[PDB]
């Protein structure tokens, strides 16, 4: 098809290179093409592309993708830390990014346009370069790739080739091969190793580009200076393929096609999926749109249903750039609830797709593991009861009777058979009795019976009701204290270690969070009774609880209020200036403030100011993160966008319209709430 021209003319000296990281977990943005066919992903970071996704959601191939400006005589400032990012899309009802970055020391402006390419598997980037002060001839613009291959930045191949006398810049790992070109070629280029002799380096010790290597192995930057004589305004070209010559011509495809019809092609893709959704007479809001854009993008194209958890590597940017699943993993309790975000919207499709990934699951695994990698391959293990009841639910609201036999039965005889004590909670650190995995269980087993009885199996349904029922009736006696520590010390705890919530037992908090009484520990998750409909919310045990908790745990942030998964959680940033590397101090989950805000609806209680602190913890690009500081409120470098917390907005969003617990299965409510 094209003729391709390798060279390997200079070899990068003093190799492999140092060691890399992944990038900052906080994004400004996500996005993909609104089809299946484009199996590419990106993430916006500290004003620049960060992970770049292909050809599965699960296969980060790039860290970043920034520009480095310089004088070339004096200063040398990196846009993702000496100028001030500020992200806007295209459009409230599409995944495209407008970033403006502006220097610090206010010298430069970098304007781009970020998206990708609906037909082909390549990430395109405009940008324009402005001399705020003095002229343009007197500044430099670099581009600074750093490839990380199949989720690995050591050992990567880098090269530069020349397809149709275009200067491509090339990287390889494996089966995975990367395309870097400009619309109006490269000044100059270099394939450096990673602070060693890199663009960067190379830089700061000459003030310009000195070094022009076509060839490197390990960790790897594919610099390249942009010509602002020929252009001030070019666009970069990223592509995939499992070779060169792919990867070579995807780019030269996107290249050839007019840039303004690929851009609106990409946004009216999007537009039209929001406009399919639910806008509750015109209430529908951004944030709405957003959310629901950002689950939709979160779902792998070759194995459907197939939803992850967040797009990030948490605290990414202080973890070795080894091979990690991050967040950009499948769990099947986050993908419930961001099934249940689809329903409310409207898409029952997607949350369909979702439901039959976890059949797939199912029946790969025999039933559900903690979490696994989209190809169903369980990543961790720990045995989460609430996982395995879940997807019963789900399949009880999609009235989904056909998955009986490899589904629900399946998952509700291997409940009934070990529950109700559970491996671990939700939080994935510790098992015992929960209440929130009770309410799972209890909410499960009833669902599961209903479906028995769809499909005429009278004694499954008995079985599974009966047992639902006797679980249901021990909640109480099994985690709600009456001699606790906290206030009146009468409430549910986090987790009894043992039958008995009254008994001293000592439990050990992860994430180095210290040993305690489970008398002592409390946790909001408790709420699930009242959203599950296994418990009112009106219930003397529900109010009682609600008074401990919100005296030790709730924090009012000038963005609104929120609360900690539960007291001395270590799972966060130690401190305002250190990165979380196992073991640190728990911070406020906005997803906590949506929860508190559908107990309240069911509480009958208005729930705005609980939808609105949602908004204000989302950042500028609209994104939710899994935590907040408690100081500002401002998101921390946890995983973002947290889907969970945007399925979370969503109901929320839509529920306090409707006045009603838009997920609780009915089912389970007049059976046992109503
Ligand atoms: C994502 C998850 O991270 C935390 O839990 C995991 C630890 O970080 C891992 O290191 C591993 O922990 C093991 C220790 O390293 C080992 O020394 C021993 O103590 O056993 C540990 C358990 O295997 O695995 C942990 C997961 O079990 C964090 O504590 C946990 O809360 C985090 N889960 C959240 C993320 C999602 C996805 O959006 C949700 O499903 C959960 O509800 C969240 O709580």
């Given at each position: 098809?094209?003729?391709?021209?390798?060279?390997?003319?200079?070899?990068?000296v003093?190799?492999?290179?140092?060691?890399?990281?992944?990038?900052?977990?906080?994004?400004?943005?996500?996005?993909?093409?609104?089809?299946?066919?484009?199996?590419?992903?990106?993430?916006?970071?500290?004003?620049?592309?960060?992970?770049?996704?292909?050809?599965?959601?699960?296969?980060?191939?790039?860290?970043?993708?920034?520009?480095?400006?310089?004088?070339?005589?004096?200063?040398?400032?990196?846009?993702?830390?000496?100028?001030?990012?500020?992200?806007?899309?295209?459009?409230?009802?599409?995944?495209?990014?407008?970033?403006?970055?502006?220097?610090?020391?206010?010298?430069?402006?970098?304007?781009?346009?970020?998206?990708?390419?609906?037909?082909?598997?390549?990430?395109?980037?405009?940008?324009?370069?402005?001399?705020?002060?003095?002229?343009?001839?007197?500044?430099?613009?670099?581009?600074?790739?750093d490839?990380?291959?199949?989720?690995?930045?050591?050992?990567?191949?880098?090269?530069?080739?020349?397809?149709?006398?275009?200067?491509?810049?090339?990287?390889?790992?494996?089966?995975?091969?990367?395309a870097?070109?400009?619309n109006?070629?490269?000044?100059?280029?270099?394939?450096?190793?990673?602070?060693?002799?890199?663009?960067?380096?190379?830089?700061?010790?000459?003030?310009?580009?000195?070094?022009?290597?076509?060839?490197?192995?390990?960790?790897?930057?594919?610099?390249?200076?942009?010509?602002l004589?020929?252009?001030?305004?070019?666009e970069?070209?990223?592509?995939?393929?499992?070779?060169?010559?792919?990867?070579?011509?995807?780019?030269?495809?996107?290249?050839?096609?007019?840039?303004?019809?690929?851009?609106?092609?990409?946004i009216?893709?999007?537009?039209?999926?929001?406009?399919?959704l639910?806008?509750?007479?015109?209430?529908?809001?951004?944030?709405?749109?957003?959310?629901?854009?950002?689950?939709?993008?979160?779902?792998?194209?070759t194995?459907?249903?197939?939803?992850?958890?967040?797009l990030?590597?948490?605290?990414?940017?202080?973890?070795?750039?080894?091979?990690?699943?991050?967040?950009?993993?499948?769990?099947?309790?986050?993908?419930?609830?961001?099934?249940?975000?689809?329903?409310?919207?409207?898409?029952?499709?997607?949350?369909?797709?979702?439901?039959?990934?976890?059949?797939?699951?199912?029946?790969?695994?025999?039933?559900?593991?903690?979490?696994?990698?989209?190809?169903?391959?369980?990543?961790?293990t720990?045995?989460?009861?609430?996982?395995?009841?879940?997807?019963?639910?789900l399949?009880?609201?999609?009235?989904?009777?056909?998955?009986?036999?490899?589904?629900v039965?399946?998952?509700?005889?291997?409940?009934?058979?070990?529950?109700?004590?559970?491996?671990?909670?939700?939080?994935?650190?510790?098992?015992?009795?929960?209440?929130?995995?009770?309410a799972?269980?209890?909410?499960?087993?009833?669902?599961?019976?209903?479906?028995?009885?769809?499909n005429?199996?009278?004694?499954?349904?008995?079985?599974?009701?009966?047992?639902?029922?006797?679980w249901?009736?021990?909640?109480?006696?099994?985690?709600?204290?009456?001699?606790?520590?906290?206030?009146?010390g009468?409430?549910?705890?986090?987790?009894?270690?043992?039958?008995?919530?009254?008994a001293?037992?000592?439990?050990?908090?992860?994430?180095?969070?210290?040993?305690?009484?489970?008398?002592?520990?409390?946790?909001?998750?408790?709420?699930?009774?009242?959203?599950?409909?296994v418990?009112s919310?009106?219930?003397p045990?529900?109010?009682?609880?609600?008074?401990?908790?919100?005296?030790?745990?709730?924090?009012?942030?000038?963005?609104?209020?929120?609360?900690?998964?539960?007291?001395?959680?270590?799972?966060?940033?130690?401190?305002?200036?250190?990165?979380?590397?196992?073991?640190?101090?728990?911070?406020?989950?906005?997803?906590?403030?949506?929860?508190?805000?559908?107990?309240?609806?069911?509480?009958?209680?208005?729930?705005?100011?609980?939808v609105?602190?949602?908004?204000?913890?989302?950042?500028?690009?609209?994104?939710?993160?899994?935590?907040?500081?408690?100081?500002?409120?401002?998101?921390?470098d946890?995983?973002?966008?947290?889907?969970?917390?945007?399925?979370?907005?969503?109901?929320?969003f839509?529920?306090?319209?409707?006045?009603?617990?838009?997920?609780?299965?009915?089912?389970?409510?007049?059976?046992?709430?109503?």
């Amino acid at each position: 098809s094209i003729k391709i021209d390798r060279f390997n003319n200079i070899s990068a000296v003093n190799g492999p290179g140092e060691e890399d990281t992944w990038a900052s977990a906080q994004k400004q943005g996500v996005g993909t093409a609104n089809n299946y066919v484009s199996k590419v992903w990106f993430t916006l970071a500290n004003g620049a592309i960060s992970e770049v996704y292909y050809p599965t959601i699960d296969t980060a191939d790039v860290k970043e993708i920034k520009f480095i400006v310089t004088d070339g005589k004096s200063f040398v400032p990196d846009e993702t830390k000496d100028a001030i990012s500020k992200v806007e899309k295209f459009t409230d009802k599409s995944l495209g990014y407008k970033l403006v970055n502006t220097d610090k020391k206010g010298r430069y402006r970098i304007t781009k346009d970020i998206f990708t390419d609906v037909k082909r598997n390549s990430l395109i980037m405009k940008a324009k370069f402005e001399a705020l002060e003095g002229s343009i001839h007197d500044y430099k613009l670099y581009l600074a790739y750093d490839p990380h291959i199949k989720n690995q930045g050591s050992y990567n191949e880098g090269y530069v080739i020349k397809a149709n006398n275009n200067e491509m810049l090339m990287a390889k790992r494996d089966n995975v091969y990367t395309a870097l070109s400009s619309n109006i070629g490269w000044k100059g280029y270099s394939i450096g190793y990673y602070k060693v002799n890199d663009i960067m380096t190379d830089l700061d010790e000459n003030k310009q580009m000195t070094k022009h290597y076509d060839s490197a192995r390990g960790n790897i930057i594919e610099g390249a200076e942009i010509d602002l004589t020929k252009n001030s305004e070019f666009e970069i070209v990223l592509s995939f393929g499992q070779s060169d010559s792919e990867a070579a011509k995807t780019a030269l495809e996107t290249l050839g096609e007019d840039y303004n019809n690929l851009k609106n092609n990409y946004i009216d893709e999007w537009t039209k999926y929001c406009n399919t959704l639910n806008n509750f007479n015109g209430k529908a809001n951004s944030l709405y749109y957003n959310s629901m854009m950002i689950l939709k993008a979160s779902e792998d194209k070759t194995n459907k249903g197939a939803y992850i958890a967040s797009l990030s590597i948490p605290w990414g940017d202080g973890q070795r750039d080894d091979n990690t699943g991050g967040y950009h993993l499948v769990w099947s309790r986050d993908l419930y609830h961001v099934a249940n975000a689809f329903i409310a919207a409207g898409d029952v499709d997607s949350a369909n797709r979702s439901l039959d990934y976890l059949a797939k699951v199912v029946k790969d695994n025999g039933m559900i593991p903690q979490n696994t990698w989209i190809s169903g391959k369980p990543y961790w293990t720990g045995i989460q009861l609430d996982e395995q009841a879940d997807p019963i639910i789900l399949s009880y609201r999609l009235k989904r009777y056909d998955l009986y036999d490899s589904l629900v039965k399946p998952l509700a005889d291997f409940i009934i058979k070990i529950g109700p004590k559970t491996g671990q909670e939700r939080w994935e650190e510790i098992g015992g009795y929960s209440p929130a995995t009770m309410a799972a269980e209890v909410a499960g087993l009833t669902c599961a019976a209903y479906i028995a009885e769809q499909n005429k199996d009278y004694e499954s349904a008995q079985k599974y009701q009966e047992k639902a029922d006797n679980w249901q009736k021990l909640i109480d006696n099994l985690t709600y204290t009456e001699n606790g520590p906290l206030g009146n010390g009468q409430y549910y705890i986090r987790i009894a270690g043992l039958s008995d919530p009254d008994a001293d037992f000592m439990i050990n908090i992860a994430n180095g969070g210290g040993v305690y009484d489970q008398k002592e520990i409390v946790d909001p998750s408790f709420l699930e009774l009242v959203r599950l409909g296994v418990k009112s919310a009106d219930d003397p045990k529900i109010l009682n609880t609600l008074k401990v908790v919100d005296s030790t745990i709730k924090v009012d942030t000038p963005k609104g209020p929120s609360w900690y998964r539960y007291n001395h959680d270590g799972y966060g940033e130690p401190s305002k200036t250190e990165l979380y590397h196992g073991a640190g101090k728990g911070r406020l989950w906005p997803l906590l403030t949506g929860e508190r805000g559908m107990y309240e609806i069911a509480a009958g209680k208005d729930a705005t100011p609980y939808v609105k602190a949602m908004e204000k913890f989302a950042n500028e690009g609209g994104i939710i993160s899994e935590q907040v500081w408690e100081d500002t409120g401002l998101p921390t470098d946890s995983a973002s966008p947290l889907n969970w917390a945007h399925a979370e907005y969503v109901i929320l969003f839509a529920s306090n319209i409707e006045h009603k617990v838009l997920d609780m299965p009915d089912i389970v409510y007049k059976r046992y709430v109503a």
